[PDB]
Design a protein around this ligand. Structure first.
Ligand code: ADP
Ligand code: ADP
Ligand code: ADP
Lengths: 20, 721, 474
């Protein structure tokens, strides 16, 4: 659903900003 | 159904797990969906699923925060199900755990929890424990009250409370600041080998009781001090749950006859009572030194006592003994016989990637400024081990603390959370620490997979292909070698002028093959000659056997001849102690261990001809000074890291630098870059390297190989046909 | 076992050792096994303590007490028969001994088959390939290899199906097969514990592997086989069998294969000593190891003891220049000493090889030692063809390859140089075949190209020296 996809977008942005 | 094996994660995030796509399709969930994980003792966790190219189909990758909440450990299996009906929460109450709230006060919510939840959109469940890092502290929190149940996503517009005393940690949960596998940086391949040996005997002992196979009962770790030998042994015990017993040589050895044996025997008896258990004996060479190297009754007896205690492990169910030493040959050889300590792992010194990983691990809690570059530090910290890289992190933190924090806070044990979080560590603080630290393992040989690739070498197109045939084909296409009865060569020697890329050639083939590169330099062969310690040759070759696949590179093979006079010397022959042991180990090394030996020399006329016989370094490759097209290629390759102006004529430079080696063309490129940088800096008191910078660099650069040396090298190569 | 007795305090080790012998008598017939014997009864010169020397005396008296302890046999294990108190070897006690050594390729295959009796193997598993690759392994390492291969198969399947319980369903184990990749994986991860030990076994080299030298093959048969196939004829005519032969001539002409091939035909244990080992003993002043080498040859009899690179020390000392002294040194003197004491009827035949006979101590060539000398010249036209055929025997070769033409070109080449040509032509076929997948045999073009890169290793300056020396000996 949409609240879970917003949670995924936030978690993915954190991982990519820190790992890249 | 929906069962997945719990393993470690690459993504460190407190709400993220990773699955391989075939399981995402069978579970009918998509990337970004929320799922529930069912662990042990009626415990559940909520997380978001992503995907990568590293998770296997049968495994689920999760971090320590999720495993702790599920009360599961690496190697267990959990059930996964989607829960697409997850919605946002309204009010939650989160409080810190007392175990971490020590020496700190102030508004921990504004410092930790609010940055953690604000625009974070994290799914939480009642009772969830999670770790928030910052201000050089790691504080963990528990969710104690929620309006929705049993889980919800925390949106930026929700109300979060944090009022009340810190909560005491429960006995059913472990502290998230305890040592685990995520605290170990370099030597990750060694940890993987240990996990294969230890995780299954301890996590699933029923399989070893039911199946006719024998578990390892003793693993010896060796390497320089400060590399993680004791960190690994403890991390394994913490992850598997086995009781950890600590023994150390010096303490046991300091005891009198009858006391050292009782203390050592007791530790083994306690491990059985507390089985499953791991016994870690540090400084094994101190507790059990070679009997033939001692004279005292206590030293001879305590070795016998350890040897019989190790054999007793056939009766002590689920007890594994680990030990640490500096060298595998510093302990009584009986310990290494079938049984007892029949497994060993070469920990060595962290490589360039591991050193960065260690710096990243020991900065997790540190607030770094935008100018901090830990990769640059990792590249400069040659010879440093984890103990030294951790020191750099602490020392850099102390520089930030003395500049700012010590002008704010009192001489007390408690600091406001806001003051700690307001403190950041800059590049000047890491640079200061780097100049103060001194590597504790700079003398030992470092073995690692090199980062040099074929694109780093200008010219020598046929030599690059030759190494691929010598090193890759024997293992990439073994059926062709068998079909035609081919016998792979065991090594190759390079000869010719210096500075033409001999080192890059050996590294580049090791890189593409993903093989370890062992660099042995002249000073090592000279030390063995002058110190009459050629036995160290056997240890070098033994490392190549354990590090395989690897490339073992012996530079400056002429240094042995130089030790005895080189050009003149005495009336004897080329054979000597060091080269004889090298030749012996070469003959005893089989191509079946995937070890390829490369040699190099700048004086091939004085190399013991024995090393060039069939079975040794039978292949000879001449590496001349680069030709006209190669010199241009070398200049272009070195400039890949910086913008080059359109007025730069690389062919003109190559035409002038007729007698230059690749090493000299690099100095020209680097000097021209430094000159461009100098102008750039002055303009602020430029975007690219201009023709004027290369023409100026030409005024300082010189060829390192004289015309007399060029003729000598060409005439030698011609003589060899 | 040593550690169990030595770990005890003074007075406890002696009582415990005595009790073990008493129980063997009470339960006679009985066998006592003392492992790590050198830990309890090391050579006397290696211990000075009162307790260590006393427990040795206690073992000696208990061994002698076996004249009263009817039907009790005591066996013991050590790493070296000369690392223990020599008193134990007196008549009785531990007078009898057996050399277990290490398994050869056939023994290694048998060990792998034994430790897989209970194992389910996939159709691709070939334990002969493993036995041939497991050089330097002993039974303990081959058992570990099999176990590790099983553990890899276990992790792949048993965890995959999540069979977490106290027992395993037999049907799951029945379908759990170990593949060839799991045995090869275990081989790559394992590490032989006896890799640097002396390897003594019957070689697999046969006469078909040696091109040319028809008269040398016959000569070795007469030197090695006839003294034991027709001992009555040697007595009848008063013949004194030769104890060894020295090979000389250009390098790379089969000196080593000749010694191995005769050892194979005779089914005798072949012992290979190489130059670096002779140099190690000289440089380290450890020439006592020569006596151990000859003692192993006696224990391994019938055997062929091959001393390669007899000139390694003479060259190390300067060869043509060096010092002002003679050819005698620590190592060659011990070699001559053991040769003189070698019994003719012990079935030990010694073969040497040198590349510089003019710097070999002439004493070794006297009657009773290496009195026979065989010259191994560069192969001739028919021999070079035979060498090329032998080196190509294991590979498909195209019909357009003219080995007689190539042999005519390589007039100055040694057998080792003809092998390089064959390997170069193969190497080209290897690349060509690999490229076709990114060919079925080695083509004439591969030999024609290889011929332009290979060179003779022995120049005419060295051949003239070899020929003149061979002429000097008639
Ligand atoms: N490989 C490694 N990876 C990460 N940290 C390491 C590693 N090796 C050492 N360290 C760190 O350096 C320190 C080593 O101290 P300690 O555990 O006492 O080890 P030692 O046995 O070297 O004394 C610890 O702070 C540990 O976290
Ligand atoms: N063919 C080449 N292409 C690119 N760079 C080269 C080449 N040859 C040498 N260099 C540069 O010269 C430096 C020295 O090379 P190296 O092989 O270590 O010389 P040495 O013979 O002193 O070991 C290297 O760091 C490399 O950057
Ligand atoms: N007569 C021959 N027949 C077949 N192969 C030979 C012959 N002579 C030499 N070779 C090849 O040359 C190589 C070296 O022979 P070897 O006798 O080991 O040399 P050396 O004894 O001088 O060290 C062998 O591997 C063999 O393949």
């Amino acid at each position: 659903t949409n609240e879970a996809q917003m949670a995924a977008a936030a978690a993915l942005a954190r991982l990519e900003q820190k790992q890249s | 159904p929906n069962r997945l094996i719990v393993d470690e994660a690459i993504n460190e995030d407190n709400s993220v797990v990773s699955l391989s796509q075939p399981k995402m399709d069978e579970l009918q969930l998509f990337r970004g969906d929320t799922v529930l994980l069912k662990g042990k003792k009626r415990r559940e966790a909520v997380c978001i699923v992503l995907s990568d190219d590293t998770c296997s189909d049968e495994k689920i990758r999760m971090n320590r925060v999720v495993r702790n909440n599920l009360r599961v450990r690496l190697g267990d299996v959990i059930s996964i199900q989607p829960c697409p009906d997850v919605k946002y929460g309204k009010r939650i109450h989160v409080l810190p755990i007392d175990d971490t709230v020590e020496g700190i006060t102030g508004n921990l919510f504004e410092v930790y929890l609010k940055p953690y939840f604000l625009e974070a959109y994290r799914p939480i469940r009642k009772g969830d424990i999670f770790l928030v890092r910052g201000g050089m502290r790691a504080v963990e929190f528990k969710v104690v009250e929620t309006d929705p149940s049993p889980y919800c996503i925390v949106a930026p517009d929700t109300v979060i409370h944090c009022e009340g005393e810190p909560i005491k940690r429960e006995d059913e949960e472990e502290s998230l600041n305890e040592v685990g596998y995520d605290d170990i940086g370099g030597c990750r391949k060694q940890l993987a080998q240990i996990k294969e040996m230890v995780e299954l005997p301890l996590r699933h002992p029923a399989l070893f009781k039911a199946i006719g196979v024998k578990p390892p009962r003793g693993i010896l770790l060796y390497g320089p001090p400060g590399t993680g030998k004791t960190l690994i042994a403890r991390a394994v015990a913490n992850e598997t749950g086995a009781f950890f017993f600590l023994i150390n040589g010096p303490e046991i050895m300091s005891k009198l006859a009858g006391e050292s044996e009782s203390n050592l025997r007791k530790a083994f008896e306690e491990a059985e009572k507390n089985a499953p258990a791991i016994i870690f004996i540090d400084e094994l060479d101190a507790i059990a030194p070679k009997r033939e190297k001692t004279h005292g009754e206590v030293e001879r007896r305590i070795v016998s006592q350890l040897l019989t205690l190790m054999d007793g492990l056939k009766q002590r169910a689920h007890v594994i003994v680990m030990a640490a030493t500096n060298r595998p040959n510093s302990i009584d050889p009986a310990l290494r016989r079938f049984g007892r300590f029949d497994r060993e792992v070469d920990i060595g010194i962290p490589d360039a990637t591991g050193r960065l990983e260690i710096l990243q691990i020991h900065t997790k809690n540190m607030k770094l400024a935008d100018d901090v570059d830990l990769e640059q530090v990792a590249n400069e910290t040659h010879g440093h081990v984890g103990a030294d890289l951790a020191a750099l992190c602490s020392e850099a933190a102390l520089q930030a603390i003395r500049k700012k924090m010590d002008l704010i806070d009192l001489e007390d044990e408690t600091i406001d959370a806001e003051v700690m979080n307001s403190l950041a560590v800059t590049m000047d603080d890491f640079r200061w620490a780097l100049s103060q630290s001194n590597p504790s393992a700079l003398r030992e040989t470092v073995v690692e997979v090199p980062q040099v690739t074929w694109e780093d070498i200008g010219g020598l197109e046929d030599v690059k292909r030759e190494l691929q045939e010598l090193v890759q084909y024997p293992v990439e296409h073994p059926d062709k070698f068998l079909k035609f009865g081919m016998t792979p060569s065991k090594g190759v020697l390079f000869y010719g002028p210096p500075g033409c890329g001999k080192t890059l050639l050996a590294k580049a083939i090791a890189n593409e093959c993903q093989a370890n590169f062992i660099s042995i330099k002249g000073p090592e062969l000279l030390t063995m000659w002058f110190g009459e310690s050629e036995a160290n040759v056997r240890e070098i070759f033994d490392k190549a056997r354990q590090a395989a696949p690897c490339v073992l590179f012996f530079d400056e093979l002429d240094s042995i001849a130089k030790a005895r006079g080189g050009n003149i010397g005495d009336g004897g022959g080329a054979a000597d102690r060091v080269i004889n042991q090298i030749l012996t180990e070469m003959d005893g090394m089989s191509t079946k261990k995937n070890v390829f030996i490369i040699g190099a020399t700048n004086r091939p006329d004085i190399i013991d001809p024995a090393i060039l016989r069939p079975g040794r370094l039978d292949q000879l490759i001449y590496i001349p000074l680069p030709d006209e097209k190669s010199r241009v290629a070398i200049l272009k390759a070195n400039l890949r890291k910086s913008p080059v102006a359109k007025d730069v004529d690389l062919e003109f430079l190559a035409k002038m630098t007729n007698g230059f080696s690749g090493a000299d063309l690099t100095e020209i490129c680097q000097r021209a870059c430094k000159l461009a940088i100098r102008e750039s800096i002055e303009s602020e008191i430029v975007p690219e390297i201009r023709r004027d910078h290369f023409e100026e660099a030409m005024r300082f650069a010189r060829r390192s190989v004289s015309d007399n040396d060029i003729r000598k090298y060409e005439m030698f190569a011609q003589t060899l046909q």
